[PDB]
Amino acid sequence: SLLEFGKMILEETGKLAIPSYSSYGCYCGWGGKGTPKDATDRCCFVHDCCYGNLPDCNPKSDRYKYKRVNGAIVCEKGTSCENRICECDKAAAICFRQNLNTYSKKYMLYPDFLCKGELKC
Numbered sequence: 713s714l715l716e717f718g719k720m721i722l723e724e725t726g727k728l729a730i731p732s733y734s735s736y737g738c739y740c741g742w743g744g745k746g747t748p749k750d751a752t753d754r755c756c757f758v759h760d761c762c763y764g765n766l767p768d769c770n771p772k773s774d775r776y777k778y779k780r781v782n783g784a785i786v787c788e789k790g791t792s793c794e795n796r797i798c799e800c801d802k803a804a805a806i807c808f809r810q811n812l813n814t815y816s817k818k819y820m821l822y823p824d825f826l827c828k829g830e831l832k833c
């Protein structure tokens with residue numbers, strides 16, 4: 713679920729999902745179009761594609777379980793949708809962590825009209 717993803721993001725990065733990743737660039741927090749602005753935005757692009765891979769799942773609301781084995785996120789077994797959603801979220805959270813070094817506040821609340829053109833998953 714969105715709230716669990718948000719908790720995972722905070723755990724990984726020390727930033728609050730809202731507002732740090734809820735309106736960032738072209739793909740974080742609402743997705744759509746455009747060339748992703750930076751590596752963090754590319755995490756969101758891929759995450760959006762990942763959810764797009766699951767047309768008959770409900771990633772915003774369906775809850776999954778995960779644990780930590782040392783630092784590492786381990787998605788625990790639920791329904792197939794839950795497992796797949798968890799893997800999407802885990803990847804995005806890791807990606808955000810890997811790209812924290814280039815995160816830029818100037819991309820928070822990024823205006824939609826600067827995001828143009830379809831980029832295929």
Ligand SMILES: O=C(O)Cc1c[nH]c2ccccc12
Nearest residue numbers: 714718729730733734741742
């Ligand atoms: O529902 C959405 O697509 C947007 C959304 C609402 N609150 C959020 C918190 C963190 C990340 C995305 C969202």
